[PDB]
Amino acid sequence: LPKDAIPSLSECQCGICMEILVEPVTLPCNHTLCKPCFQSTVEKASLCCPFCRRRVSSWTRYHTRRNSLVNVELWTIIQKHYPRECKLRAS
């Protein structure tokens, strides 16, 4: 994704639930999913990436402790180009 370029809506949708990516969590494999999905599908379930099966339990501990699970740079980009979609999910 080029700089200041407009991302497709599709590139901004969580691949698990199809909703807009709210507070996206990018795993060390570089697959991304929304925090809600992360919290249900990974943090309290598999500790796998749901796309590729990468073990992620130690990764989770590390960033949990440091409040750095969220990919702040991608979150910023999603809020900028799809603000309305983000507020609708918050609601």
Binding-site ranges for Zn ion (CB under 5 A): 14, 16-17, 29, 31, 34, 37, 49, 51-52, 54
d(CA 84, CA 66): 29
Q: Which two three-digit tokens encode residue 87?
A: 């507020």
Least Å distance, CB 83 to Zn ion, is: 18
Least Å distance, CB 4 to Zn ion, is: 26
Least Å distance, CB 51 to Zn ion, is: 4
* 3 state DSSP class of 40: helix
Task: Output the CA–CA distances (angstroms, integers) from residue 60 to 32, 48, 57, in the order listed.
Answer: 14, 10, 5
